[PDB]
Design a protein around this ligand. Structure first.
Ligand SMILES: C[N+](C)(C)CCOP(=O)(O)O
Length: 175
């Protein structure tokens, strides 16, 4: 497939991400994630914690500089009113952890899509704690808009997440 795989950073596109959503099949709530690594060094998968939903693939174990990782997620199958929400992390060659969060609620009635990235000192794994850290911190909304910011440690991040049941999220970490 495409998810659980890495590709040349330069080739990461919305087209690539939408094709990821396709392989997930007709499921009302899903997300396809793409992260381009341009930090200067390699990344190593730590883990993924799902608040809601689940995933069908593995976190690309290795992400070398200039390469982009591909990942996906979705709500639980069946008559269950739930979305796709989680946080996952990658260990960096600088010795710090990169943390990512995405939330795609079941009922877009009251709720919306939310996401964020953050770098944790040392080595930390994704948990209900990191999830709450990014969710209830100051996450970006999946407003189909691009956002950027300084990640500290001299990295900077550029990103975007769509606002809908079948979402796509594209991020980039530069040095
Ligand atoms: C919508 N959600 C239940 C997945 C996230 C938590 O929302 P809230 O209980 O803080 O308002």
């Amino acid at each position: 497939a495409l998810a659980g795989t890495i590709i040349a950073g330069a080739s990461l596109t919305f087209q690539v991400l939408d094709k990821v959503l396709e392989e997930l099949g007709k499921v009302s709530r899903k997300i396809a994630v793409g992260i381009d690594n341009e930090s200067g060094g390699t990344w190593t998968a730590l883990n993924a914690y799902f608040r809601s939903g689940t995933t069908d693939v593995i976190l690309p174990e290795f992400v070398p500089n200039t390469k982009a990782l591909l990942y996906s997620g979705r709500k639980d199958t069946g008559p269950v009113a739930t979305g796709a929400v989680a946080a996952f992390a990658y260990y960096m060659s600088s010795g710090n952890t990169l943390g990512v969060m995405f939330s795609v609620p079941f009922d877009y009635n009251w709720y919306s899509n939310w996401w964020d990235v953050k770098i944790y000192s040392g080595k930390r794994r994704a948990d209900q704690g990191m999830y709450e850290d990014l969710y209830y911190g100051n996450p970006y909304r999946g407003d189909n808009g691009w956002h950027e910011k300084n990640l500290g440690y001299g990295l900077r991040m550029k990103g975007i997440m769509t606002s809908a049941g079948e979402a796509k999220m594209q991020i980039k970490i530069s040095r």
